[PDB]
């Protein structure tokens, strides 16, 4: 059996996570099991780097007025 964290999101973010897995942008293949087109299963020891990558992707194409 597999123990970790279930992540639910839109298919675009799921595919972004898949690309991160295949490109080894986090340094390893920790994105192990894919269950649904909109749900994935990720080991919980590196949820922080995934959050940082998601935030960087989100605010990259944002053009903050600050």
């Amino acid at each position: 059996v597999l123990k970790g964290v279930l992540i639910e999101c839109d298919p675009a973010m799921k595919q972004f996570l898949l690309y991160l897995d295949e490109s080894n942008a986090l340094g390893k293949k920790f994105i192990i099991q894919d269950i649904d087109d909109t749900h994935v299963f990720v080991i919980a020891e590196l949820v922080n780097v995934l959050q940082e990558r998601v935030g960087e992707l989100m605010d990259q194409n944002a053009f903050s007025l600050t």
Partner: protein
């Protein structure tokens, strides 16, 4: 000066809040003006601020203006004096003018009329009332090259001397750095040397009050000064130029951007100036209607600044044209004046007054500052919100509706980064479905539709899929003209596609719906021009972007000019009745088939 919350606070600087709030204005120490629109004195305060400063944003409640040296030069150019402007600013301050503006205003306004530039007998001279300033600038190395041969003293009468004609731009750039800005005043009332023409506009072309204000500010004390007037394309822009040309009553030269804008200006002159066709000439190497010996000449850029070999007839026409003075040289689409070859155009012809007209003064590369000395100060800036409130400008309901990225496309979008992702978010199936739904809806409600789409490679399959007319751009001259001519007066066809061709001042007919897809990156000028093609909720225009892509950032950063103008972009996330009818790319098979044909570019 203090940064307790990261905000520049000036509470201690301006405490003069005597009694008590009746003045709807706030001043800033460095420089800024905040105006309250919901005031009984709103019109008078607006008129006062327009004549002295240029706006930086005009929302519905609190306008914000900026104080600049060129704005003060324009203010002092009009009959307004230093004492009057200072006392009226102090009159409506509600907080007290900080002691950093009065000194700044005084310094800007002191050196206005000290140095003047004049044109006489095809010769450029610089005249100064005070002889000392000439010796002040004599030691400047850049100026000394203008005189030839050294212009020992040029004893006249008031001290003046000749300058090199082709180096006028350099001295214009230097003078402002020397705190001695030049002024371009043409006293056309009494010349007796220039052959004035018998142009006279018909007394049937009435003009709106804002055009009256712009013209009145152009001619403040019986003389015409070079300036820039910014008016929307739908509003009356050519009429202002025609009226200015008639008032100047001199030989007029009009410069357009495209080879079709010259015909537009000729039509405007024939409509509102009552000028015989013999005097009107167009010099664009198409008919050559004897431009030699003409009163009004109309031509375009990229023809007066050729660095290559020129046609034999064109060479003689240019030689004749460069041998006489010009009255009120009119430039169209002045925003694209600061170019590598367009700047020298003003140096290749000699004219007294240079009047520039445009609708979108915003431009990248921060070269608009150069336009302050290339032509003159920003004279008039029309308020678009109050313009559309009077009903003479269509109130366009702006919309920014985005579509999610399809799963078959987002993987490729995140996979590639070397400039190959443009087609991926340009040809988003969801955006295609949204565009098709909008087209069908506005055809069912019978609205004229213009669909702007750059990246014509995508526009090909975007337009042939719906089997609708489109303008590739490198097609021909007749086909585009006939398509645009039959677009308006034909009930069967009411939707057209334009690929970066309509990004200028053309003769496109009235339309109510504009849909832009995959435009340039941050071209605020392009989006403002596209919006200008609609106004003339009577109308409304949509912008389609793809989520989680660079197009979102581009749309966010390109709409700031319009929100400064006062428009608001409502976000639409769901389209009502999207699944009510059948649209293209309904199933995943054709969506995944699209990947092969969109990656089939392989431009390597």
């Amino acid at each position: 000066k203090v940064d307790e919350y990261g905000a520049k606070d000036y509470r201690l600087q301006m405490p003069l809040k005597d009694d008590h709030t009746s003045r709807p204005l706030w001043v800033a120490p460095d420089g800024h003006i905040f105006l309250e629109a919901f005031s009984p004195v709103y019109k008078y305060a607006q008129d006062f601020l327009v004549a002295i400063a240029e706006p930086v944003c005009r929302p519905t409640h609190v306008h914000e203006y900026k104080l600049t040296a060129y704005s003060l030069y324009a203010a002092v150019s009009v009959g307004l004096q230093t004492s009057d402007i200072t006392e009226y600013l102090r009159k409506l301050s509600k907080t007290g003018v900080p002691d950093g503006i009065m000194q700044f205003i005084k310094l800007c306004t002191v050196s206005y009329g000290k140095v003047k530039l004049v044109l006489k007998h095809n010769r450029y001279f610089v005249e100064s009332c005070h002889p000392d300033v000439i010796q002040h600038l004599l030691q400047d190395p850049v100026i000394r090259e203008c005189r030839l041969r050294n212009s020992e003293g040029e004893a006249t009468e008031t001290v003046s001397f000749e300058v090199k004609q082709e180096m006028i731009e350099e001295l214009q750039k230097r003078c402002i750095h020397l705190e001695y800005p030049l002024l371009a005043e043409y006293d056309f009332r009494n010349d007796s040397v220039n052959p004035d023409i018998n142009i006279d506009l018909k007394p049937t072309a009435v003009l709106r009050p804002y055009q009256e204000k712009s013209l009145r500010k152009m001619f403040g004390n019986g003389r015409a000064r070079s300036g820039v007037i910014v008016l929307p394309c739908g509003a009356g822009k050519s009429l202002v130029g025609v009226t200015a040309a008639c008032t100047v009553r001199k030989r007029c030269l009009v410069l357009g951007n495209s080879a079709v804008s010259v015909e537009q200006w000729k039509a405007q002159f024939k409509m509102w100036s009552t000028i015989d066709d013999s005097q009107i000439c167009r010099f664009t190497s198409d008919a050559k209607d004897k431009p030699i010996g003409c009163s009004v000449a109309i031509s375009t850029y990229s023809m007066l600044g050729h660095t290559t070999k020129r046609s034999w007839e064109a060479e003689r026409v240019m030689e004749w044209l460069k041998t006489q003075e010009w009255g009120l040289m009119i430039l169209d689409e002045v925003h694209t004046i600061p170019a590598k070859m367009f700047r020298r155009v003003l140096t290749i012809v000699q004219a007294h007054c240079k009047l520039g007209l445009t609708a979108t003064l915003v431009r990248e590369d921060d070269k608009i500052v150069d336009l302050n000395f290339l032509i003159g100060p920003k004279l008039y800036e029309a308020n678009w919100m109050e313009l559309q409130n009077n009903g003479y400008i269509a109130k366009v309901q702006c919309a920014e509706v985005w579509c999610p990225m399809s799963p078959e496309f987002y993987r490729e979008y995140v996979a590639i980064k070397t400039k190959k992702r443009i087609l991926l978010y340009t040809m988003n199936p969801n955006k295609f479905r949204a565009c098709q739904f909008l087209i069908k809806f506005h055809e069912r409600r019978n609205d004229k539709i213009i669909v702007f789409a750059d990246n014509v490679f995508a526009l090909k399959e975007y337009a042939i899929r719906l089997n609708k007319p489109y303008i590739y751009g490198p097609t021909s001259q007749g086909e585009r003209m006939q398509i645009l001519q039959n677009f308006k007066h034909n009930p069967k066809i009411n939707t057209i596609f334009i690929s970066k061709v309509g990004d200028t001042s053309f003769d496109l007919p009235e339309a109510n719906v504009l849909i832009q897809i995959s435009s340039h990156g941050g071209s605020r000028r392009q989006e403002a021009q596209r919006l200008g093609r609609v106004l003339r909720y009577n109308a409304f225009f949509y912008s389609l972007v793809s989520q989680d892509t660079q197009e979102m950032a581009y749309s966010t950063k390109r709409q700031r000019f319009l929100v400064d103008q006062g428009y608001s972009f409502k976000v639409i996330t769901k389209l009502a009745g999207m699944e009510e009818e059948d649209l293209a790319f309904s199933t995943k098979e054709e969506q995944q088939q699209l990947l092969q044909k969109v990656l089939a570019a392989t431009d390597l």
